[PDB]
Amino acid sequence: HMAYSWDNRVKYVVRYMYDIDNNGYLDKNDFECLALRNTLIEGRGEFNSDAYANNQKIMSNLWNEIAELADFNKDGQVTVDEFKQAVKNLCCGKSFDGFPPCFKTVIGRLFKTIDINGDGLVGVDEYRLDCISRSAFSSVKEIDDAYAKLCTDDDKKAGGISLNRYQELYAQFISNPDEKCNAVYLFGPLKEV
Ligand SMILES: [Ca+2]
Ligand SMILES: [Ca+2]
Ligand SMILES: [Ca+2]
Ligand SMILES: [Ca+2]
Ligand code: NA
């Protein structure tokens, strides 16, 4: 589908936020791998067995929640189309606070990872590093043009995107069908997945 279509945006979220083993669908192995990845990134490569246990619990609960809401054919996997139906059911027409917990809790964690300097704002430097974590770019101006469209004058006055703003933009990213909405740039310039 068109790069900034709702279909491609939801497919992008499934690919990059959840499908860590890159096999095209979600299952328990993705969440096992996310538990380990989060542990090691939190530890700067150190493995803390208590941090790991905490993360394994968070990710097991997350997977149980997503499968409860999205496993339409009861096969223990959640496809892109199943995830899209859960988004239509539970996100479309709602603001972020009305999303189910399994669609909400993921953002706090991504935001904390992006916010390298811990000042509670994602600024342009942090956004550039986020963008190159998923995709290839030749032009820093392409990334910076996306940040400039994404952010409002109040975001720019603040020096970046706060957590509740990041969540507001995410809610529009995953729910608004308008391909021209500023929030379509949340994860950088897009291509078809
Ligand atoms: Ca997978
Ligand atoms: Ca399924
Ligand atoms: Ca920051
Ligand atoms: Ca920054
Ligand atoms: Na939930």
* Domain range summary for the chain, segments of one domain joined by +: 6-185
Solving technique: X-ray
Task: Judge contact between 86 and 95, C-beta under 8 A.
Answer: no
**Residues, CB-to-ion distance under 5 Å, ligand 4:** 123, 125-126
Binding residue positions: 19, 21, 23, 25, 30, 71, 73, 75, 77, 82, 115, 117, 119, 126
| Structure resolution, Å | 1.6
CATH code for residues 6-185: 1.10.238.10
Beta strand extents in 58-176 (DSSP E only): 121-122, 161-162
Pairing of strands 161-162, 121-122: antiparallel
Binding residue positions for Ca(2+): 19, 21, 23, 25, 30, 71, 73, 75, 77, 82, 115, 117, 119, 126
Task: Judge contact between 165 and 155, C-beta under 8 A.
Answer: yes
Cα separations (Å) of 143 from 15, 55, 97, 124? Answer: 20, 32, 29, 9
Task: Judge contact between 135 and 193, C-beta under 8 A.
Answer: no
Distance 154 CA to ligand 1 centre (A): 38
